């Protein structure tokens, strides 16, 4: 059955990006999915998106732009202590400049640079470069 809808959303977006599509539909919507998409938005990776609200779990139509090489989920949601964070990016990122570990912390869902500035850890959700 369907568990971890964030994985399904990120796989759908990646498969849409690899075919050179411009626009993709995502079902179902979630709070975690919307926060992750906003994080990719602020860094200029997935452009624009709009949430279609029916009286179920909603859907999201995302405007892909072209910069994104790979967006990916990490399952299970491993705890990321602040020291271990450094190891994590050397495992997931192809460079120490670009790419993003996304953590849910008590200060919110954010990337690894902002989590290092706020000096906190949390659960790893994904990465995108």
């Amino acid at each position: 059955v369907r568990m971890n809808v964030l994985a399904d959303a990120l796989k759908s977006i990646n498969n849409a990006e690899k075919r050179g599509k411009r626009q993709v539909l995502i079902r179902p919507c979630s709070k975690v999915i919307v926060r992750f998409l906003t994080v990719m938005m602020k860094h200029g990776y997935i452009g624009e998106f709009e949430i279609i609200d029916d009286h179920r779990a909603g859907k999201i139509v995302v405007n892909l732009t072209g910069r994104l090489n790979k967006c990916g989920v990490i399952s299970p949601r491993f705890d990321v202590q602040l020291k271990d964070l450094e190891k994590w990016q050397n495992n997931l990122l192809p460079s120490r400049q670009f790419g993003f570990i996304v953590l849910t912390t008590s200060a919110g869902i954010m990337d690894h640079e902002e989590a290092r500035r706020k000096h906190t850890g949390g659960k790893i959700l994904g990465f995108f470069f």
Partner: peptide
């Protein structure tokens, strides 16, 4: 055709080449 060793080397080298090219392009934006 050709052994998988240099296919793996060529793929990882071209990948690091795209990494460096996008790094220089993103550095140019500042």
């Amino acid at each position: 055709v050709l052994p998988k060793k240099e296919k793996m080397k060529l793929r990882r080298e071209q990948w690091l080449q795209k990494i460096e090219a996008i790094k220089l392009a993103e550095q140019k934006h500042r």
